[PDB]
Design an enzyme around this catalytic site. Structure first.
Site, mmCIF file in Angstrom:
data_model
loop_
_atom_site.group_PDB
_atom_site.id
_atom_site.type_symbol
_atom_site.label_atom_id
_atom_site.label_comp_id
_atom_site.label_asym_id
_atom_site.label_seq_id
_atom_site.Cartn_x
_atom_site.Cartn_y
_atom_site.Cartn_z
ATOM 1 N N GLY C 10 1.172 -6.345 2.692
ATOM 2 C CA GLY C 10 0.565 -6.660 1.631
ATOM 3 C C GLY C 10 0.764 -6.139 0.122
ATOM 4 N N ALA C 99 -3.732 -15.391 2.019
ATOM 5 C CA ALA C 99 -4.953 -15.201 2.614
ATOM 6 C C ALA C 99 -6.396 -15.342 2.111
ATOM 7 N N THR C 145 -4.638 -9.546 3.857
ATOM 8 C CA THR C 145 -3.427 -9.531 4.750
ATOM 9 C C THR C 145 -3.263 -8.130 4.976
ATOM 10 N N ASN C 206 -9.152 5.078 -3.572
ATOM 11 C CA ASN C 206 -8.670 5.020 -4.919
ATOM 12 C C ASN C 206 -9.592 5.653 -5.854
ATOM 13 N N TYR C 224 -2.017 1.812 -11.775
ATOM 14 C CA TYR C 224 -1.731 1.906 -10.407
ATOM 15 C C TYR C 224 -0.323 2.366 -10.048
ATOM 16 N N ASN C 228 0.342 5.671 -6.970
ATOM 17 C CA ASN C 228 1.421 5.451 -6.171
ATOM 18 C C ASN C 228 2.227 6.555 -6.076
ATOM 19 N N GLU C 254 3.817 16.349 17.194
ATOM 20 C CA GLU C 254 3.092 17.497 17.048
ATOM 21 C C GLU C 254 1.843 17.455 16.199
#
Lengths: 35, 184, 440, 219, 436, 60
Positions: C10, C99, C145, C206, C224, C228, C254
């Site tokens: 996506g 989608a 998606t 967010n 945005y 990121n 682990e």
């Protein structure tokens, strides 16, 4: 009462992380002894 | 709770002929309703629960959430009508390893899954009024290796009609069963 | 030998991957062309890159990633960016119609034209790996998606590859804000099926990152990209023990042994502690007992769940840089003294520490500063119960009038699938009270 | 107070005023019908027996050979009356009209639709009790009326959609009005299910189109 | 690869779709000749959603124009950008409607739908994977309203899974061109409830009320109203012509705003409308695009939303913006006025962001959002219709052109169905005991 | 709770546990480790059936 700085953001900080939104720096740490 | 009761034969925890049946069951209603109305077939008063949602409207047998009705009798028998809408019901158990496990039987969930605390089995009801006689002490001997000690609580969710909830020590043939526990 | 194959789903998954793959090329010496310079070298080692990269004969390193998407508008800036040639062409798999913010449309209708193609390209990557440690899926529960086809990756990935590790870094929808309005239907139907098929899940929402970039960093109005950049500093530090030698190094397997009590509770929280700007970085010192306190600080957590409402079931700290193991062990013992940080009683050990040597890498155009040390943390509280009984409210609100159901039912679905998936959410809420509560 | 999307109600402390109200669930004013005018004229071959068994309409002619093309859609226009005689003459007669007859109720159900909607468009809770008992009775009594009402679900099911959820929350306490079919949200489930039984294919699709919370039967 | 084919219906339709192709060809750098004189590279990548390719370096739109009068095709060909269409794509009749929806429906419109279907099949065959069609029309006439329903009805059975959008100038309450128009509106909302996937409602009274008070320009004309209509209809599907930080196209708005199947009549609005004398004094930011975009003074329909409840709204933005500010303003407005927003839909507002603005300005926004102020637009048209229809005013031009009297009755019934159905969701609450 | 088929014959020869079922066909997989679990009790009846029931289960 507080031994550390890590208490001073937990102890009577009335700010709920879930409900308080877009809050400033000073409005997090607001203890009972100012209200 | 239900500790000093003798617990032999049958043990009934709700009835429909009663001045106040819902004393011990705590009830939650959301987009639903509960009342008491007559059924046309058996000509006697039953209960109603409906609702658009099968998850919030329910009644839970210990009203206090902490309290546990400890019943040591194997089989559970309800008398519940078919309505062609979704319907779930749940009991907990207690086993010899002192842990509490679940047995949910939903109208729609096709394949049974066994996971640490939960087992979700299907069922299919017949066409008329029916009583279900829930097998137990084998379902905790085919989905876990344990054996049976206590059944802590029971909860029934949306969209059916309820009369005479009781437990058993053994499934009996209907001629052996007393006339007040016969359906009609 | 230590391979991991990233897979990004996506538009959010692609745009996370760009800030995460610019990060790795700065971290080793690979330039945007693909090949290390050979005029000057900053890669001192030999096969530090071999977890993520993969080499042809001549000079060139191409990563093990597939940037799958259902809309071409987002993946075609990857095809014309500066890293236009880092990526092999046949990896960035793209659909034709997206989608449409439906889990259902990206599950049963549109996703099935691309379930076949990625399960070929995953094979050609994974047969190259001799020693594949485990994949990484990066998604977001909101979209169609990032919820729908990402559901149907792991149902096919489990029956194909068996017991390989498949992490998710996800985006939970935020409590107050979120862009969409079909979004609580998507997030109830995918947490149901990113449950039985996955091994660990590091949720971050967010709205909390916006709160971090306002206070900790001094960014008024983030975008945005600044979100990121921080998510890359959490992915890298998880896998920094795979690529750089450490004093106490921790692999992927682990983690799963040490912060997952039962096979349903696999939702750690997250924190990266010294998020500071370059005017507030070089004045203060950042000693290990100064940055350990800020992982447990409730404002600095990365999900809107408050740890002062429940009991810590684990904690997993990861340190980098100029850290000595005698100051890791000194600051942990301070946390256990104070009575307002609640640990569950059947966990008296409580911690899992990891020491790495290589300090985190500063990115050009980025927002943070170059520091000597950092720390991440992955606790597992019972305070994540409170951000799940909120989603049960916003799913019940719409579903009791049956709004928006005519879209999902209208393509390849049943009506009870919203109601078999609410029960698992109602099953999980009583696990987090019975696991958490004390034993008498 | 304040009104809405203004510079006011963006204040730090100001209350809004919402939308005023809507015209649903509240009782509509009525109109003069056509049953009254044709009764005071005196065309109707009906008279009333004040029996002590009950009240029943006498008939001065047969019922098996009436003029149903003229008299069926005029009794359905008497369904919007609440006084003494007219709420009885319409209701009691319609059942006797519907009980007798073969091969003539079929070509007239195109012509009954507009009084069905116009009585249901009144939001009076007692005619909705009565107009919904005949809709069960309309479907049962004839033959092949079920297959001819399926395109005519688009116009009569809107009004049954709002009131399907009308039911009593009497948590244990028994309901004594179960003799008379007086709750409508149980009467609606009796009717919408009884529409599906007769009609073959596409009987299910049209109600789920029209009452969107529907949940099929006969599985 | 997701093309959109344009349908222009009538004399309103050709005068609206003459200006939309002037406002989108300047957006893509196309000269009046047809050629491309662009100055970027995002201006040519997805130009194939609306255009074609011709040998010689030419782009022709995917537009088909219909009319029942031959006189308007000459005007729309002889305009400024009128020669950029392929000339065998106009379809014109020989004798007009006559402001009769009946003449456009049965009598004289059905001889021309057989030809426009051949044209639209050839124009929609060449697409890679067709997404949708548009229709632009007005609901007072007899061609845009008369064949503009019979195009849609018999295109939905031949392309049923494809998206269909409509722009409807529905009739104005007090300023009225025609005395015959209540019949044409009430017989058309029947055909347009069940067919189109999308419909936007615009009133010429509200466009006048914008140009008199916001734009403050002394002499408006129909070019200055088609500018507003085109600048909204380009911004609703600019989300798929230019990339975005967060992008959401036609399906991601249509499935994400229409709660139930019959409610797809929306109210557009466009954010930075300032007068020319007050263009240089006003500083464009997001909290004031939100302010101008959200008020009853601004909406393109003639119903103000203080008389009802927003069901679902959306605003798609253009420019270089920050998603925190874009989200926080919608949170601010929704909490600080909350009786106009429904409660069984918790977080109503939908947002998307593109980042190539309209030319000449830094940033912009649009708005479409269902309110239950939309029922007054039907509860008034029904009163004009039932005023004119009790004494059977103009019926000899409609029944003697081959109709029945009960079609008007079934149209008014299917109109107050929607009126009394919007009144359900304006008054429905979260917990069902407090209605009654 | 009431599972054990035991009762106490207060004799003048001492004390002996009567049985309502045969001892030879009990369920020793189920009954034996819950009488060994009664060895840790001292109060009068609980210590009695614990030390006395075991000896009869093992002699049959």
């Amino acid at each position: 009462k507080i031994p550390k700085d890590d208490l001073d953001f937990r102890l009577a900080t009335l700010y709920n992380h879930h409900t308080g939104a877009f809050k400033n720096k000073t409005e997090i740490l607001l203890h009972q002894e100012t209200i | 709770m239900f500790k000093n009761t003798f617990q032999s034969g049958f043990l009934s925890i709700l009835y429909s002929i009663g001045s106040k049946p819902l004393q011990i069951w705590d009830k939650k209603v959301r987009n639903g309703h509960i009342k008491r109305i007559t059924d046309n077939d058996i000509q006697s008063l039953v209960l109603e629960i409906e609702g658009t949602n099968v998850s919030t409207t329910y009644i839970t047998c210990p009203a206090d959430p902490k309290k546990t009705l400890g019943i040591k009798l194997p089989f559970l028998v309800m008398i519940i009508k078919n309505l062609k809408k979704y319907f779930t019901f749940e009991v907990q158990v207690l086993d010899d390893k002192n842990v509490r496990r679940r047995f949910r039987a939903s109208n729609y969930q096709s394949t049974t899954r066994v996971k640490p605390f939960i087992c979700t089995m299907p069922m299919r009801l017949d066409d008329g009024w029916n009583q279900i006689q829930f097998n137990l002490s084998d379902f905790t001997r085919r989905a876990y290796g344990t054996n049976y000690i206590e059944t802590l609580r029971v909860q029934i969710h949306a969209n059916c009609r309820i009369r005479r909830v009781y437990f058993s020590d053994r499934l009996y043939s209907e001629d052996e069963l007393p006339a007040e526990f016969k359906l009609y | 030998m230590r391979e991991c194959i990233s897979i990004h789903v996506g538009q959010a998954g692609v745009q996370i991957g760009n800030a995460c793959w610019e990060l790795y090329c700065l971290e080793h010496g690979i330039q945007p062309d693909g090949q290390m310079p050979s005029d000057k070298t900053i890669g001192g080692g030999d096969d530090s890159f071999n977890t993520f990269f993969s080499e042809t004969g001549a000079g060139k390193h191409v990563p093990r990633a597939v940037f799958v998407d259902l809309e071409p508008t987002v993946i075609d800036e990857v095809r014309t960016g500066t890293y236009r040639q880092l990526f092999h062409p046949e990896q960035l798999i793209t659909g034709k119609e997206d989608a449409a913010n439906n889990y259902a449309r990206g599950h049963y209708t549109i996703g099935k034209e691309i379930i076949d193609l990625v399960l070929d390209r995953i094979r050609k990557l994974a047969d190259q790996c001799t020693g594949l440690q485990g994949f990484l899926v990066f998604h977001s529960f909101g979209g169609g998606t990032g919820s729908g086809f990402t559901s149907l990756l792991m149902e096919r990935l489990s029956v194909d590859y068996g017991k390989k590790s498949k992490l998710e870094f996800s985006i939970y929808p935020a409590p107050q804000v979120s862009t969409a309005v079909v979004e609580p239907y998507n997030s109830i139907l995918t947490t149901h099926t990113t449950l039985e098929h996955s091994d660990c899940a590091f949720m971050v929402d967010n709205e909390a990152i916006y709160d971090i970039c306002r206070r900790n960093l001094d960014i008024e109005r983030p975008t945005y990209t600044n979100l990121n950049r921080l998510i890359g500093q959490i992915v890298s530090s998880i896998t920094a023990s795979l690529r750089f030698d450490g004093a106490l190094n921790v692999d992927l397997t682990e983690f799963q042994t040490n912060l997952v009590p039962y096979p349903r509770i696999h939702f750690p929280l997250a924190t990266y502690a010294p998020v500071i700007s370059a005017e507030k970085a070089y004045h203060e010192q950042l000693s290990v007992a100064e940055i350990t306190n800020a992982c447990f600080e409730p404002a600095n957590q990365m999900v809107k769940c408050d740890p002062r409402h429940g009991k810590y079931m684990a904690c997993c700290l990861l340190y980098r840089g100029d850290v000595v193991p005698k100051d890791v062990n000194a600051a942990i013992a301070t946390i256990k003294t104070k009575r307002t940080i609640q640990f569950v009683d059947w966990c008296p050990t409580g911690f899992k520490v990891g020491i790495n040597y290589q300090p985190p890498t500063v990115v050009p155009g980025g927002d943070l500063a170059k520091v000597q040390r950092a720390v991440c943390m992955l606790s597992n509280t019972t305070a994540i119960a409170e951000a799940w009984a909120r989603l049960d409210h916003k799913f019940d609100l719409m579903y009791a009038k049956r709004a928006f159901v005519h879209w999902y039912v209208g393509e390849g679905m049943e009506e009870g699938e919203f109601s078999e998936a609410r029960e698992d959410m109602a099953a999980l809420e009583k696990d987090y009270e019975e696991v958490g509560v004390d034993s008498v | 107070v304040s009104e809405g999307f203004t510079v006011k109600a963006m204040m730090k402390n100001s209350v809004v005023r919402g939308p005023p109200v809507a015209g649903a669930f509240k009782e509509r004013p009525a109109k003069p019908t056509t049953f009254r005018k044709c009764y005071e004229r005196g065309d109707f071959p009906i008279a009333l027996e004040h029996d002590s068994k009950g009240n029943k309409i006498a008939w001065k002619v047969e019922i098996e050979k009436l003029d149903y093309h003229h008299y069926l859609p005029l009794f359905f226009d008497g369904l919007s009356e609440m006084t003494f005689p007219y709420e009885f003459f319409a209701r009691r007669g319609i059942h006797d009209m519907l009980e007798h007859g073969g091969n003539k109720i079929l070509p007239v159900i195109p012509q009954l639709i507009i009084p069905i909607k116009n009585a249901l468009n009144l939001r009076n809770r007692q005619i909705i009790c009565v107009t919904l008992k005949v809709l069960q009775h309309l479907v049962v009594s004839s033959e092949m009326v079920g297959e001819a009402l399926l395109p005519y679900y688009r116009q009569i099911l809107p009004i049954l959609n709002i009131f399907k959820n009308m039911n009593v929350n009497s948590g244990d306490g028994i309901d004594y009005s179960q003799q008379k079919r007086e709750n409508i949200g149980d009467l609606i489930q009796e009717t919408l299910e009884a529409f599906e039984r007769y009609g073959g294919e596409d009987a299910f699709i049209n109600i789920k189109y029209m009452v969107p919370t529907y949940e099929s039967c006969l599985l | 690869m997701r093309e959109i084919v344009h349908l222009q219906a009538g004399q309103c339709g050709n005068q609206i779709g003459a200006k939309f192709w002037e406002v989108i060809s300047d957006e893509h750098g196309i000269d009046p000749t047809g050629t491309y004189h662009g100055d970027s590279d995002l201006q040519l990548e997805r130009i194939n959603v609306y255009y074609n390719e011709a040998t010689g370096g030419k782009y022709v739109p995917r537009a088909v124009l219909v009319d029942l009068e031959p006189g308007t095709m000459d005007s729309v060909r002889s305009g400024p950008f009128g020669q950029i269409f392929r000339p065998d794509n106009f379809v014109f009749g020989q004798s007009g409607a006559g402001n009769n929806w009946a003449k456009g429906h049965y009598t004289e419109g059905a001889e021309l739908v057989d030809s426009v279907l051949d044209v639209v099949r050839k124009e929609a065959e060449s697409c890679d994977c067709l997404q949708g069609f548009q229709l632009t029309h007005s609901l007072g006439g007899g061609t845009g309203s008369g064949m503009g329903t019979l195009l849609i009805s018999k295109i939905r059975e031949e392309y049923p899974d494809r998206i269909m959008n409509t722009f409807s100038v529905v009739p104005s309450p007090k300023v009225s061109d025609t005395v015959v128009e209540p019949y044409n509106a009430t017989l058309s909302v029947h055909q347009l409830v069940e067919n189109t996937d999308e419909t936007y409602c615009i009133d010429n009274e509200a466009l006048y009320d914008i140009c008199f008070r916001t734009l403050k320009l002394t002499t408006p004309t129909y070019g200055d109203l088609n500018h507003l209509v085109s600048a909204t209809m380009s911004g609703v599907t600019t989300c798929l012509r230019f990339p975005g930080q967060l992008n959401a196209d036609l399906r991601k708005l249509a499935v994400n705003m229409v709660p139930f199947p019959r409610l797809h009549f929306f109210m557009p609005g466009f954010a930075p409308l300032t007068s020319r004398g007050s263009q240089q004094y006003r500083a464009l930011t997001v909290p004031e695009l939100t302010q101008q975009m959200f008020d009853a003074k601004n909406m393109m329909a003639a119903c103000d939303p203080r008389h009802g409840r927003y069901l679902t709204v959306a605003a798609v933005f253009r420019g270089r913006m920050s998603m925190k500010e874009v989200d926080e303003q919608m949170l601010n407005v929704q909490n600080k006025n909350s009786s106009y927003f429904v409660e069984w839909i918790p977080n109503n507002v939908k947002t998307a962001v593109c980042d190539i603005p309209p030319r000449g300005l830094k940033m912009s926004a649009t708005f479409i959002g269902n309110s239950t102020a939309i029922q007054e637009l039907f509860k008034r048209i029904s009163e004009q219709f039932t005023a004119m229809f009790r004494r059977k005013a103009f019926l000899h031009w409609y029944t003697g052109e081959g109709m029945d009297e009960m079609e008007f009755t079934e149209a008014e019934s299917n109109m107050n169905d929607l009126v009394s159905e919007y009144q359900q969701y304006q008054d429905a609450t979260a917990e069902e005991e407090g209605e009654f």
